[PDB]
Symmetry: C3
Subunit: 251 residues, 3 copies
Amino acid sequence: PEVLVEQRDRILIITINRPKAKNAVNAAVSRGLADAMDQLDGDAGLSVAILTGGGGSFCAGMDLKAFARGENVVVEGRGLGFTERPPTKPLIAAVEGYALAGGTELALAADLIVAARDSAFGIPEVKRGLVAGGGGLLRLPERIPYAIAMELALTGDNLPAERAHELGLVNVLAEPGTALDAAIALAEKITANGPLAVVATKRIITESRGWSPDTMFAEQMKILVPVFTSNDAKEGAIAFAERRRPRWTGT
Amino acid sequence: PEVLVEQRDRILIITINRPKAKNAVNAAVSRGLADAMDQLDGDAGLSVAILTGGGGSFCAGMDLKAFARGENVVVEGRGLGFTERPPTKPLIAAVEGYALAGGTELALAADLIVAARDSAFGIPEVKRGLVAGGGGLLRLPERIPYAIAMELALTGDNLPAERAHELGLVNVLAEPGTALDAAIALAEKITANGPLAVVATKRIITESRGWSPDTMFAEQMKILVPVFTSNDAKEGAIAFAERRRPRWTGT
Amino acid sequence: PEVLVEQRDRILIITINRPKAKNAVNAAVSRGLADAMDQLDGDAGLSVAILTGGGGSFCAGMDLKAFARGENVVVEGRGLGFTERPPTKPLIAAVEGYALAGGTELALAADLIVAARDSAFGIPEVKRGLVAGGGGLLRLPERIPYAIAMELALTGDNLPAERAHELGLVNVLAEPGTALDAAIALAEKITANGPLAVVATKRIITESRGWSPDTMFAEQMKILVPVFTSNDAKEGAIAFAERRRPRWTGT
């Protein structure tokens, strides 16, 4: 299987299993990722997903051999796996080695990035006379300073993970080989919080980028009201009062 | 009094005076803050305000006890004091200790933040099954890198002031206990500049976020014309020519 | 000549030649810059431009003496040289010494900034009772953290290049006196990539700021299709396959 899926408590671990091809995205991998996100969002037993690449490399981008023969790597309505339709639940990318071109675009479509100190990002498409069309040009300038995003886009240069951490692209710098365990620790903190409040918090942040300051509080209030009337909200207050862990139901 | 107000030259010092409750915002504090901003903006003898919390702690958020009994902490049209209606004159937050939840949202509604090296920010609402609705989810992603804002929102973790300074959230790192004096020095630099030009500069920056590149220069020009025809503009030129301090009138 | 223009391979070097006036922009310099950009964009033999100031100083802003006598420094439809109409090809600013007021606004209207370790930026207009109207208030908050942009705007303080590099404003920190050579190295990396893909990458990044997430991929696709059907795209693939340098034609 070109994409491996493992359930661990409330956490879905998604592993691109194409290491001899540096985990490049073909049609198989693209469909596997989309299915994995449909599983994450559709299963009430899951809170967070982690995306990683096996064997020490995250993702070299779209498979060039598969692009050559004309495979349908881009699935209409999802893009490269999920670049044009990110999941509603939180997604963490855990990055070893190279995440280049489509690979950096997979990481950008996640919410959070955990990267080994020796890993690298980049969008080298222009070096081949191409353009990064998986959302890298639309998200990188919103994730790191605009001029740096512009530089990486125009040169195709690598962005080493230490610099990406300094620029705010990488949330956690991990020791080489341990990115996945650092992402699990981050995912376990997110799963310990209120499922409805977590999904509503991300929804407000992502959908507010297409809102207007005119109407930002009004729009946000519609998302807030179901969380504040939720059973979990009452359980949260009782558990904090009794100095114990809350037992979420997702209602 | 739950909010203390002091006039020092052209600077208004606003102190939340509820230290045994960690300066949490009840109805009293919320109304006091709104009044303080109305005083700042309405008094021609004032240029800048500083918001701080007494006793070594900025603000623990909305008072939970007051939220429990149903106090009207949120005043319609202002939010938590002023989160939904920031003042037109510059506001500096000086942060000792913890600024959490609503407290971080008060700081975000200011223009500038001075923070002690040992202070911390955070929005831990999701840990209780709630969501930060005082503007934290709408401003933090515009103040620090998007992924970091997302991480703090999803985990509820603390953001230590040193990191917040590295991320651009904190303007000045102060020695512990001295945040207020560092904020005064920053406020005194702002008050030395042209009052109309200062108020117009902030107005252009804040209102440009809801403008369109199509019409950005046109909109900005309408704000520029009164400042450039102002008496202060002529006084600014004369004083620089004569190598002396300008005497602003605010006209 | 108050603006010097030199062609070196595919790189246009634009030097403000007014060093006794600290390279301040008068009507002459403003028209020279606009002409230089028309040359860059109109000549198919050029890929990238560098803007610098001769003698160790980038640009002190608009010439005050020329503003005093009423020269038309701002040319309608271009602003200060090009602040209101940046070129379509990539522009790099190489900064020695001071880049203040209009000077920082010239640098902001570029795509990339190379700055000597001992150089400084700033917008001190408010210190004279004026406002920075050359785009500094509209671009700085999109280039460095919002609160820092706000601080520099309200105080007029200098932003030293080392800090500007930490904040993401400066792409490359250069040794003092060597900014121009560092900018050439950066320009040479950009010129080695596909001309159409480079111009299309910048166009997507700049025009996406005025797009909506609703329609962002649709808008981007219209720019992508000519690059992907281009002769250069095929040459890029052949050259990478044969492990040799691609010979771009710009078609």
